[PDB]
Amino acid sequence: QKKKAEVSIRTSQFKVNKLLNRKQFVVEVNHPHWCGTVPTQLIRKKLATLYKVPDENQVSIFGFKTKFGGGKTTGFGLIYDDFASLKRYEPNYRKTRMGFGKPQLPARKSVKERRNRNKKLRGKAK
Amino acid sequence: MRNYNNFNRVWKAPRRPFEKERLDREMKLCGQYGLRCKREIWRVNMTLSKMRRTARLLLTLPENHPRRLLEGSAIMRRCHEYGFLDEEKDKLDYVLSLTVPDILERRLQTIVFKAGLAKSVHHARVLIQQRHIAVAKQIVTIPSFIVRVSSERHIAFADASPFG
Amino acid sequence: TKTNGQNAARKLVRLRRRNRWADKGWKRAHTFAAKKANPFGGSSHAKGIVLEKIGVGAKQPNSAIRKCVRVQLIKNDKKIIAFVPNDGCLHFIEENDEVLVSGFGRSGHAVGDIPGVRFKIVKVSSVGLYALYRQKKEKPRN
Amino acid sequence: SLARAGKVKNQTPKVAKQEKPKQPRGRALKRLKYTRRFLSKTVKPGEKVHMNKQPP
RNA sequence: AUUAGGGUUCGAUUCCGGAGAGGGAGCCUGAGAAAUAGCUACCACUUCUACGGAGGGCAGCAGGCGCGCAAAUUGCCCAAUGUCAAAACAAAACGAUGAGGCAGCGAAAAGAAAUAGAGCAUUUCAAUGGGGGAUAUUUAAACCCAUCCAAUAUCGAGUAACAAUUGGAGGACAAGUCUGGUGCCAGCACCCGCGGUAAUUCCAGCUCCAAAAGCGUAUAUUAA
DSSP states (O other): OOSSOOOOEEEOSOEEETTTTEEEEEEEEOOSSOSSOOOHHHHHHHHHHHTTOSOSTTEEEEEEEEETTEEEEEEEEEEESTTHHHHTTSOHHHHHHHTOOOOOOSOHHHHHHHHHHHHHOOTTOO | OOOOOOOOOOOOOOSSSOOHHHHHHHHHHHHHHTOSOSHHHHHHHHHHHHHHHHHHHHHHSOTTOHHHHHHHHHHHHHTTGGGSSOTTOOSSTTTTSOOHHHHHTTBHHHHHHHTTSSSSSHHHHHHHHTTOOBSSSSBOOOTTOBOOGGGTTSOOOOSSSTTO | OOOOOTTOHHHHHHHHHHHHTTOSSSTTTTOHHHHTTSTTTTOSEEEEEEEEEEEEEOOTTOOOEEEEEEEEETTTOOEEEEEOOSTTGGGGOOTTOEEEEEEOSSTTSOOTTSTTOOEEEEEETTEEHHHHHTTSSOOOOO | OOTTTTHHHHHSOOOOOOOOOOOOOTHHHHHHHHHHHHSSOOOOSSOOOOSSOOOO
């Protein structure tokens, strides 16, 4: 116990994308002596602070690869204008990770069997 | 199908499977550098042969021929890095004389033993897989890691190891 | 002696087409005459049915009775005398057993001391024959 | 004619292997082989090396 | 692929080009088809029927029989790459996509590398991942890899039973003038040759040898 596990952050290639209303950057987590992996929830709360972003959720963060043999990881992150441009511009899978879902429709097959039986039918029976 | 990912051979088995002259020369190297298998010898025979062979081709060539300068200096650089050769030697003829030990001396297993962090070479080979040796801040688990001569200062031990 | 000249490349190309046919390791590769007669029909292995168990008196100064089998190839319907490779292993073979047959290893000719026997059995009823001899698997009763 | 089959292999008595300790594996053995031959063995010259011998 | 060089050989198979949709032929629609998950016919096969009839075309992906020496799941998904389209996304309101991707099966090949290290009796000072598991990371979701055994607070190896095999030991060819058993028998042996009563070659035990998570054998091919 030299101290608590200490986790800092550096973003690398930073880009302001005004087309989608987001900022684009590559995130690097410097964490030594963090048992396990740094779960995302913490990276977000750090980034939201370091840029002084007014909300936590405006920061969406996806994909991470640790480094072989020591605590450091690398990943991508986005930062948006407020509540809107997460909802519009983000995939449905990266949304559900935040908790905002659109629940998965019935298993893809089940749609296919119905599509076909309807290739039989005419009028209002279909 | 449709997956384009290139793979290749690193080694070759010798003709004349068993010659008591070669087998002798083999074991004398296996025990000295702490090697697991003959396979790891035949490997530095091929990376040495390929290297050697392009040295001939470029050497048969006329001086100042554009390949001999550009492609010739690059083989002659990378052997100064990795320290296959001494920075005193630049003729490109020297590349054409190298030996299996030169590339084995440069293998992280021997160097951790030569640098003196280990008893001989068997401690060194286990002590690498045991994840304790780091090259520069980077834990390196592969005994066959070839140690660039700029990196022979930095080895020491890991910071996740017992030793830090 | 041979002919030499800048413009002579017909004579040289023709003269080789003619003189390669005199070659035998390939007067073999170029004759269907080889393929029709190799009862495997070109394939490295084949499956037969065991027709008959056969002793074959060994050749020349060697005295022995080598343990051979007749075989009915399932591809070709051809018949083949094949060799059972090791001690007592003829006990692992019964009549009408399916048997995988391989060559002896000099491609189309018999391995010395069995007169005219070019093939040996590698498997009996989908179980390996050497793996039965050396005791590993038990021959499935069917 | 065919009943001599399998004579000798069955007729030879069985020793049922023998228990022994395990050897080293990997490079460990490669060291065990190297200690024998290139260490601890000095030769009277006399150039010869016998890997097996037998108590004749 | 193999090759000093010159060559010898393979190229059904990912990319380009050609051709076909069981066999043949004919044609409509359309900018483009002699299209086959489009039509018409005949041939060979075949599936329902209430006997009047009506159907089918896996050399699409899974899978079945058959055949053969010989080859995986009737699996998830459009997250990515493209395509078509009347089409951005989101907001009651997420187009299809067996193209494609992901995993399952997978010792065809290819890379890395465990099966111990430290000071023959012993004795004991550590270290490790196989494996267990995770606040989690991964991913469309799950996997696998990587990170982790406290960060206030969580696993563990000593006969390392967590136990390396496949072929050899007369010659070519590296390694036994060991000990049993057999007696031209059984078998080995690519070739040469072993076995007919002391077998350096068979069958065994021990011993050593080569290669090693790989190693024999068969056929084809290149060098020789």
